[model samples]
Target: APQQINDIVHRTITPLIEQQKIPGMAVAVIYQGKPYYFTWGYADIAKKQPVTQQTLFELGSVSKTFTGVLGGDAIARGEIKLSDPTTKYWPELTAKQWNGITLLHLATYTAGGLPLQVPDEVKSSSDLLRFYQNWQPAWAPGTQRLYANSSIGLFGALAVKPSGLSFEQAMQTRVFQPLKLNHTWINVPPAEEKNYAWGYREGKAVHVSPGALDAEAYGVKSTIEDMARWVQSNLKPLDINEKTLQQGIQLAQSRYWQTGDMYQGLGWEMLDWPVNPDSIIALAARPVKAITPPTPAVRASWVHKTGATGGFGSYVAFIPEKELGIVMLANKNYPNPARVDAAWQILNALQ
Candidate 1:
C-alpha cells in the first residue's frame, strides 16, 4: 500500500503538473527518520528522458543554505567569527558605510539595507566588493530587515577569504563532502554535463548564459537524492559540533524582522502559528485571505526556504518537532506554482 503521505503528495501534485505544464519535478519526503522520493515528468523535453532521482536542477536561492552552512563550518574551524565586521576579510569594502556591518548582520539579513537582487552596476564579485566599498547604508545596521541576495552573496565571498579557499571550493570541501552528497555541485564540472537539466524558457529547453555574479548569488545544481541528505542532516542533528548546531538553529529560529506575519531568520523565513500570533511554527505556510477582513486560519507548522532562478524553483521545509522534512525541485520559471503550499497541504492531510 502507498504510504498516506506519499498518496496525499501524489494526488495534490498530479493536477499541478497537468495544469501548470511543468517539464519536470523531483520531491523527497523525510518521515519517521527515513526518506521517500517521488519523481515525475521529463528532465529533458527534447531528449524525452523522464525525470528521476539523479536529474540535477539548479537549487536557485535555496543555495543560500549552502552559504549559511559554509559560514557555520568556517566558524567551527576558527577561521572567522560572526561578530567580525564585513571589512575584516574585504578591506576594500570598508570605504562604504558597510565598514560597520558585522558578519552577523550579513548572515542574518540585517546589514543596513540593500536591494534583493544584484544591481547592474555590480557585475562581478570584484564589482560587488567595489559597490559595497562606495555604497552608503540607507539604514543603520540591525535596525531593520530587508531580504537581499546581494548582501548574503557578499557575505559568502567574505567568509571564503579567511578559509584560504574560494567560496565554491570551500562549500564542496566542507559541507558537500561531509554530507556525502554525490550530485551537489556549486560549479558543475564538465564531466557531469550530460546529467544537468537544461534551463527552460517558454516551455522549451535553452542554454543558460553564465557569469560570475550569478554563481555567487544563485548557482548550485543538485539532485533530489542529495537534497534529501541535506534535509536529513538538518533535522537529525548529527556529526556537527554542539555549539555550531546551536548557533545554526538559533539563527534559523530567531525573528530578525517581519514582512506581514512572516519574519526573517538567518537565511530562512519564519511563519508564526495561526493559532497564536505570538507563537512560532515549525513549518512556513502562506495564508489565504477572504474578501472579509482580519483573515481566517491557514496555519503551517514548518520552517521553509524557497528558491527560484531563470529556469528553476525549489523549496525545502521541515517540522522540527516532528522531525519531518520535504524538498521539492522543479524545472520551470516565471510562475512558481507554489510547491511549498502544495507540500504543506500534503503535510496537513497526513497530520
Candidate 2:
C-alpha cells in the first residue's frame, strides 16, 4: 500500500471513531490483489474485548450483493431466467398484475409499482402473496423506479424455491462454498455463537429478530477478512466461467432503469462523479443526501452502499478503475459511514 493511502485511512477514520463513539469497527481494503485489514474499538464493550480481524459484523444490505450473486449462479445454471415472471416460481401468487412482474424487474428495483416496505397488512410470505394477489399497479411495468425491500426480499425467496432449498441454503451451496467464505452466514451458526457482535441502539444493546427474507435484503454476518476476499473476486473477476462472471458484473452495473440522475442496476446503483469523467462508480449510496449532485471536488471519486437494521450500520464500496474496495462494519448505527469517501481519499492520496 502507498504511504499516502495508509495515511489517509488513519486520518479519516480516527475522527470518525471519536465522533461516533463507536465501540468497535473492522475495515478491509483490497488493492491490486492484496488485502490491507484494519480493526479498531471493542467487540464486547462490557468485557472490554477489542475488535479483531475475526470479529463478525452484520453486513445488512451488503448481503443483497450475495443475493445477486446467487441469482447470477441460478441463471448460469439454467435454473431460472432473469426474464421469467415471478409468479411462475410461486404459482400460488394469484395477483393478476403481478403476472407481468419479472425477476429482472425485481433485481433492478424496477418492479414498477411495489412499495419500499411491505404494507402493515402483509407480514409473512403468505401474507405478501395474498397482498400481491389483489394488488394493482400504479404504473406500467418497468416505467417507474421504486426501491422496495419487500419486493426484492420476496424475489429472492421465490428464486431459491425452485432449487428445493431455502434462500440461506441455496446461498451456502452456491456462492459461499465457491468463495470459501466460511465465516459468513445468513443465520448465526451454533458453533460461532461467541463471535457474533452485540448490536446497540441509542448506545444501549438491542436484540434484533432475524427474518426469513433477509437474504435478499439484509441477512449476512461476516468479518472484514472475509469481505476482503469478496473484494478480491470483484477486482480480478475469477475465471470460473466467462459468461457467469460477465453476467454478475453486468447485473451489478447495468442501467436497466432510471429515476432522474439515479439509475438502478441489478442490486447496485450507478453513480456518476461529476468532477471526473473517467471515475464512474457503482454500488448503493444511501442516506440519499450523500449523493446530491454538484458535490464538492474534495469528495473524490466513489461508489457506496449503507445498510442498517435494529442495531448495525454497515457500508461497502469499491472503485473498479482503481481496483480498491473498502468496508466499514460498526456495532452502533452511526448515521453516515461514508465508506466510499474514505476509500476515495485514500486512493486520491496514493495517486
Candidate 3:
C-alpha cells in the first residue's frame, strides 16, 4: 500500500525537487484514514544526511493553523467571545482609532490593514503596544482582508489569556498535549533538536531566529508523521475524544469570510470541491485585498493553507467528504505556488 502511495507521491514530487532546486522535502498523505509518507534529498547537504520521517521541518505560517484552533478552542471553553473588542484585553489602546476592532477581526485578517509582520522597530512589548496604540485603520475593521502576522500573533496571545499561561505553555497544554501530537512543538526541546533539519536558503544553512511574537506567528516545528496526524485530525475531528477540542476543530474549519471563489476559515482557506487548478494557484499565490460581506455561506469541499519563512516552506490541504489530505514541507523557501501545485497534483492523482 505504501508502495502504491509512494508511486503517486514520488512521481508527483521528484520533478518538483529538481525544478525548484530544493535541498530536501517531506510529503505525507492521508487516504481513508491511512497514512503514507515520502521523503527526498538531504536534511543537511553538508552532513550528507537524507531526510527521515523523524526529520523536523518548520511549519512557518502553517503554525497559524494551530493558532486558529487554539483561539477556537478558547471560544469553545468560553474563555473569550469572538465579538469581544480588541480593547477588552489591552485597555492601553484607548485611541479612538482602536474602536470597532474585535477579536474576530484579528482571528480573521480583517484587523484594518496591519502590516504583514509586526514593525521592525517594535523590539519590545511596550514598543509593540505603542505600535498598536498609534495604529490607524485603513478602512472599517471587517470590510476588508489583509494577511498580517501582527493580527494573528496578537490573537494567539489573547486566546491564551484567561488561563494565565504563556502562549507557548497554552499551546502545549491546551492544544498539542490534548491532541497527542507528541512530536509537535512551539519550541523543540534540546533532546529533539538532533532531529531538526537544517533549512537551506540561498544554498546556505539557516534556521528561524528569535523575534517578537515569532513563536505565535510562525514558530512550529514538526515531523512528517506528526503533520500527517494533524491533517488526519482536521479530516476526522470527531474521532478525537476531547469534546471541546473536537468542537474547536470544527469551528476552525468553518468559513468566516468569502472573496470570489475562496472562503476563509479560521485556519484553512476554503474552495469548492473538484477545485480548478488555476483557482488553487490564484488563491495560494497571495493574500486577497477584499472580502465579500458575509452572506449565505457556500459549502466548502476543499480547504488548504500555505506557509513559508526565510528558510523553510510548507503547504496543507484536505477534502473532508473524501477523507483525504496532504502535507508538503521543504527545507528551502521556494515559492508557495510550487508547493500548492505539487500537493494539488499529488492529491488529484490519489483520487
Q: For every model shown, what is its TM-score relative to the native structure?
A: 0.85, 0.85, 0.94
TM-score ranking from best to worst?
A: 3, 2, 1
lDDT of candidate 1 over 1-351, digit per residue (tens)? 256976888898888778767788988888866888999988888888888888899988888877776776677668888789887887666465766789877876677676676676656667766666666666778666666777787777777788788777787777777678878987778988777987677766764456444555678889999998888777655544555543444344445455566655556665753313223222222222211221211124356778877777788877656677789888885354357557677655654
Residue 85 local lDDT, model 3 = 95
What are the per-residue Cα lDDT tens digits for candidate 3 across 92-153?
A: 87989878889988888887787777877788889988888888777777777787788888
Q: Candidate 2, clashing residue pairs?
A: 284-304
lDDT of the structure predicted as candidate 2: 0.68
Question: Of models 1 and 3, which has the larger TM-score?
Answer: 3
Choose the strongest candidate by lDDT: 3
After TM-score superposition, what is the CA distance of residue 156 in candidate 2 from its true location, in Å? 1.1
Residue 300 in candidate 2 has what lDDT?
A: 23
The reply for model 3, stretches above 4 Å from the true place, is 281-300
Candidate 3 — worst ten consecutive residues by lDDT sum? Answer: 281-290
Tens-place lDDT per residue, model 2, 46-118, is 8787889888888877777777767766776688887898878888876677768898778766665666655
Q: Pick the candidate with the highest TM-score.
A: 3
